[PDB]
Amino acid sequence: KKDRGVLKIVHGEETPMIGDRVYVHYNGKLANPFVFSIGKGQVIKAWDIGVATMKKGEICHLLCAYGATGSLPKIPSNATLFFEVELLDFKGEDLLEDGGIIRRTKRRGEGYSNPNEGARVQIHLEGRCGGRVFDCRDVAFTVGEGEDHDIPIGIDKALEKMQREEQCILHLGPRYGFGEAGKPKFGIEPNAELIYEVTLKSFEKAKESWEMDTKEKLEQAAIVKEKGTVYFKGGKYVQAVIQYGKIVSWLEMEYGLSEKESKASESFLLAAFLNLAMCYLKLREYTKAVECCDKALGLDSANEKGLYRRGEAQLLMNEFESAKGDFEKVLEVNPQNKAARLQIFMCQKKAKEHNERDRRTYANMFKKFAEQDA
């Protein structure tokens, strides 16, 4: 707006983008480190317009976009502060507190809501890798299943933090790009970091657990089971977890059901927990494995699979005694269990080997300190 509300005086040719996290130093003056997030009304409107024009380290002076009517006591009446702001540095938004998905918002959106997992979305995708564009199209897909249209799980995750019509840049770390496997169709290598430009044109959210009737849950349950299973067979474990989770999400707290419904429901529920257990043992997330077994056995205490997988997992977490507890209960439920007995053996074996190691470590690290007394 031509109206001179703010004007300024004065590094890299990059400047803070909406949502960026800024690092600066300031000072004001009427007639005479503070890190925030630009683009958001999290500070003066002027600080959102001027600081958002400074190149990195661009020390400048601004003359302001503030409380005309009455900001005092603490904020002098219809004042007009002046600032010196050393733009130290700015970074993109870390969407999952894990440096896995860093976003740079390019064009604010109109959304009030966001795509939830299961939503069907219409977007535009552009994927670079090492600076080479390997994908550019408009595509429709469902959130959590982008792997079906050759889209890394990172995009699905970011879509849940994106508004309708929003445009952004996403820096996916290996964890969210394709993986150890890479992507030959696109010529992408194992664990390659990727950069995507994305535009969320629109989306239709998936129904929440409670908006579906028992009829639908049970019908949808058979479909996602199948889908989660096809994923398992192809080693797309992360996606199988999402598919089996919907089942737990839909039927875990259900109450007031026909004996017939209730039974068909606990049936799905048990299979889902046990299937999740496999996925987690595959994903090497043992604590998750065990938790799924604890669920399953709360529905069926004599479940061989739950007791076995519970032991595979506990053995891997080194709870040797606990794990043994598992296989004991396996053979009581099935004395002819092949692998059962054999593991118990190993439980002992490894608990012995683990106790030895803890001892050489304790001794040495202890010795270490003692020699630290000069």
3-state secondary structure of 227: helix
The CATH number assigned to the domain with range 7-92 reads: 3.10.50.40
Per the document, the length of the chain is 374
User: For residue 158, which of 97, 106, 116, 95 has the smallest C-alpha distance?
Assistant: 95
DSSP result, 95-138: TTSSSSEEEEEEE----SS-PPTT-EEEEEEEEEETTEEEEEEE
Task: State the CB neighbour count (10 A cutoff) for residue 165.
Answer: 14
Retrieve residue 6's tokens: 């703010």
Retrieve residue 212's tokens: 């579906």
Helical residues (DSSP H) of the chain, grouped into ranges: 45-49, 153-159, 214-233, 237-251, 259-282, 286-299, 304-316, 320-332, 338-370
Q: Which long-range contacts (CB under 8 A, 24 or more apart) does 348-353 make?
A: 348/320, 348/324, 350/315, 350/318, 350/320, 351/320, 351/321
Retrieve residue 101's tokens: 């998905």
| Paired sense of beta strands 120-129 and 101-107, if any | unpaired
DSSP result, 62-79: EE----TTT-TTTS-TT-
Question: Taking the mean position of all CA atoms in its chain, how far away is CA 33?
Answer: 29
User: For residue 344, which of 301, 317, 371, 308 has the smallest C-alpha distance?
Assistant: 308
From residue 309, give the alpha-carbon distance in Å to each of 252, 277, 303. Answer: 21, 7, 10
The span from the CA of 189 to the CA of 178, in Å, is 8
Report the CATH fold assignment for 93-206: Chitinase A; domain 3 (3.10.50)
Q: Do domains 7-92 and 93-206 have the same CATH topology?
A: yes
**214-233 helix and 237-251 helix, angle to the nearest 10 degrees:** 160
* 183 DSSP 8-state letter: B
Rg of the chain over Cα atoms, rounded to whole angstroms, equals 28
Give residue 35's region: left, alpha or beta (phi > 0; psi -120 to 50).
beta
Specify whether the CB–CB gap between 50 and 58 falls below 8 A: no
Specify whether the CB–CB gap between 114 and 161 falls below 8 A: yes
Give backbone dihedrals phi and psi of 276, rounded to 5 degrees, phi first: -65, -40
| Paired sense of beta strands 194-204 and 101-107, if any | unpaired
The span from the CA of 345 to the CA of 12, in Å, is 63
The span from the CA of 52 to the CA of 39, in Å, is 8
Angle at 24 between CA 21 and CA 30, to 5 degrees: 125
Q: Tokens 């889209």 sit at which residue? A: 151
Dihedral angle over CA of 278, 282, 284, 286, nearest 10: 10
User: For residue 50, which of 60, 41, 42 has the smallest C-alpha distance?
Assistant: 60
The span from the CA of 62 to the CA of 81, in Å, is 9
271 contact partners, CB below 8 Å, separation of at least 6: 225, 247
Give residue 256's region: left, alpha or beta (phi > 0; psi -120 to 50).
left
The span from the CA of 159 to the CA of 143, in Å, is 8
Retrieve residue 102's tokens: 């860093």
The span from the CA of 168 to the CA of 273, in Å, is 37
DSSP result, 83-97: EEEEEEEEE-EETTS
Specify whether the CB–CB gap between 345 and 324 falls below 8 A: no
Describe the strand order of the beta sheet including 132-142 as a list of residue ranges.
93-94, 101-107, 167-172, 194-204, 120-129, 132-142
Superfamily of domain 207-364: Tetratricopeptide repeat domain (1.25.40.10)
The span from the CA of 167 to the CA of 106, in Å, is 5
Strand partners, 94: 102
The span from the CA of 340 to the CA of 359, in Å, is 29
Domain spans of the chain, in order of start: 7-92, 93-206, 207-364
